[PDB]
Amino acid sequence: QYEDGKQYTTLEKPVAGAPQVLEFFSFFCPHCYQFEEVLHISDNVKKKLPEGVKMTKYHVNFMGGDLGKDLTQAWAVAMALGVEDKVTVPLFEGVQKTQTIRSASDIRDVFINAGIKGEEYDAAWNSFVVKSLVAQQEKAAADVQLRGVPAMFVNGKYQLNPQGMDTSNMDVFVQQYADTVKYLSEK
Predict the structure, then answer these.
(1) What's the per-residue H, E or C state across the chain?
(2) Chain centre to alpha carbon of residue 73
(3) How far is CA 186 from CA 15, 48, 132, 143, 181, in A?
(4) Which residues, in sequence order, are bridge partners of residue 22?
(5) What intrachain disulfides are recorded?
(6) Measured between alpha carbons, how far is 179 from 159 in angstroms, rounded to an integer?
(7) Which of 169, 170, 175, 184 has the maximum number of C-beta atoms within 10 A of its C-beta?
(8) How many whole angstroms separate alpha carbon 108 and alpha carbon 29?
């Protein structure tokens, strides 16, 4: 029942060297909020992935203007410090639920409240390591010529098509999405 054009589509120009499973999102994106905070798509895809398949998750600049670039840099900080699990939920809620994240310092407040020392965050925020992590996120999006989020790519060749899945039941939707990723990851 897996058909190119229903649950997924195939890239016209496949990308070499991409990660096995590459997810793109923005904290500004209401559909990304739905994917992560209500459906837990990434966590459920991870539960169905074959042994030795790595998932990479990158933030994108093209939503939210100045704040969008700030959020990409913050995600790079989160990746550099290994604290993605601590900040994803409060960053999504601060941008979309409470809408208390309007500036770079509000982003920093989320990390401080999650227990990241200000000195650690500030050293990372200003680091060339984080600058290179920002460039990597942008280059990954440039490779697939990303035009929208949320988005998921498998082996630089297939892009998930959530419009072809059942939206009448959220649990069914997550199962179909995760099974499709596993199917594509096996080629």
Answers:
(1) CCCECCCEEECCCCCCCCCCEEEEECCCCHHHHHHHHHCCHHHHHHHHCCCCCCEEEEECCCCCHHHHHHHHHHHHHHHHHCCHHHHHHHHHHHHHHCCCCCCHHHHHHHHHHCCCCHHHHHHHHCCHHHHHHHHHHHHHHHHCCCCCCCEEEECCCEEECHHHCCCCCHHHHHHHHHHHHHHHHCC
(2) 13
(3) 17, 12, 31, 22, 9
(4) 56, 153
(5) 29-32
(6) 14
(7) 184
(8) 19
Amino acid identity, residue 48? K
Identify the experimental approach: X-ray
Tokens of 47: 């539960």
Tokens of 102: 């309007």
- For the record, the structure tokens of 29 come out as 């994106």
The pair of structure tokens assigned to 153 is: 């790519």
Strands of the sheet with 8-10, listed across from one edge: 8-10, 158-160, 151-154, 21-25, 55-59
User: Helices 128-143 and 118-125 sit at what angle, rounded to 10 degrees?
Assistant: 60
C-alpha closest to that of 110 among 123, 92, 126, 124: 92
- Count Cβ atoms below 10 Å from residue 178 Cβ, excluding itself: 20
The alpha carbon of residue 182 and the mean position of all alpha carbons in its chain are separated, in whole angstroms, by: 18
